[PDB]
Amino acid sequence: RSISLVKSLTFEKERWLNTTKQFSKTSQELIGNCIISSIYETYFGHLNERERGDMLVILKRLLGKFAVKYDVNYRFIDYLVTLDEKMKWLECGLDKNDYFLENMSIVMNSQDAVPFLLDPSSHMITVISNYYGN
Amino acid sequence: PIQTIRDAVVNILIHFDRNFYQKMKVGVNPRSPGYFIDGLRALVKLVTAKYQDLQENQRFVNVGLEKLNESVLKVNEL
Amino acid sequence: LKNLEKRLLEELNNSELMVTLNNLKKEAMNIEKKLSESEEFFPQFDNLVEEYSIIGKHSVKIFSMLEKFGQFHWFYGISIGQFLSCFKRVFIKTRVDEILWLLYQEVYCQFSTALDKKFKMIMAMTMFCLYKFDIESEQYKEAVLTMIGVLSESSDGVPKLTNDDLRYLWDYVTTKSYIS
């Protein structure tokens, strides 16, 4: 039974070994990822995807310039969007667009600033109404 | 002069504020430091939260690895 | 599966328990098997996307054209909702080519009336360009382009005719019937 349990948990042991190996890289790039995500939340609400990618180019250039390493495969949705919240927003009425997911994350991860919405379709009114209920 | 990560990080933040307000074409008109301050507070709270989460996850993974090592040692002994 | 992995991690960290761990592992294996069984619908969706991508790209080009119309004058702007209602009424009113042709006809009939005669004519010319430059060939595209160039007095040069429909347009240009 112990051998069977070890054979069943070998995959979990390999996953834990991979997590322990990637922990060093995560701890190295945590400060850069936090810089880029905070700059996302406090700068990128009022920009389109082209300007967003442009200041990704400038921001990643600055991080590489001042010897602060970051995640090469970094993404805002993956970093500050959980699957529970993503499914909650999509079932409350948010579109499947990655730009709309990023905008929703910017809106819902702003506890110190009152968010201002520019929705010409008036769809976020219904989305936030379905999110917060009565 | 830079001797730690803090001076560097402040340099990224100020350089990004300058580049942002440069490409907004604000020109002679004044630039508010509100984006700079908001980014600083967001960075502080998010570094604290991410460090706490990473420490908790690493502690859980280390405890699981220690339990697996103890079980493997017991299996090798028996 | 993510919640079950978190629950398994919390259960192993907190410590009968072997039976619960085996049940969690069996549930995770069943979830993985269900995901692998339900991951067999991808080729049909990929084929449908590859079939309708031309209509999607043409509709994006049309909407970009209409947005550029709306930037010129404050009355000419267009929203996604009106364009989608105009798309929806197509099915109410060479299957891919027929759908694209009805899309062009219905969008012109719906959104041409919100423009003056000059912008109506610009819209008709540009929609003809977007349809024919994709459906027809490169000699057709360059002949239409140089006909527009000699109409606009920007590029001078006779097209290399082989078409049959362009005989009337070339007669209109050579006989100086600009409105025609």
Swiss-Prot record, chain C:
Lineage: superkingdom: Eukaryota
Record localization: Cytoplasm, Cytoskeleton
Disulfide bonds: none
Subunit organization: The dynein complex consists of at least two heavy chains and a number of intermediate and light chains. Interacts with DYN3.
Function: Cytoplasmic dynein acts as a motor for the intracellular retrograde motility of vesicles and organelles along microtubules. Dynein has ATPase activity; the force-producing power stroke is thought to occur on release of ADP. Required to maintain uniform nuclear distribution in hyphae. May play an important role in the proper orientation of the mitotic spindle into the budding daughter cell yeast. Probably required for normal progression of the cell cycle.
Family: Belongs to the dynein heavy chain family.
Comment on protein domains: Dynein heavy chains probably consist of an N-terminal stem (which binds cargo and interacts with other dynein components), and the head or motor domain. The motor contains six tandemly-linked AAA domains in the head, which form a ring. A stalk-like structure (formed by two of the coiled coil domains) protrudes between AAA 4 and AAA 5 and terminates in a microtubule-binding site. A seventh domain may also contribute to this ring; it is not clear whether the N-terminus or the C-terminus forms this extra domain.
Note: Present with 195 molecules/cell in log phase SD medium.
Name of the protein: Dynein heavy chain, cytoplasmic
Segment of the intact protein contained: 3559 to 3758 of 4092
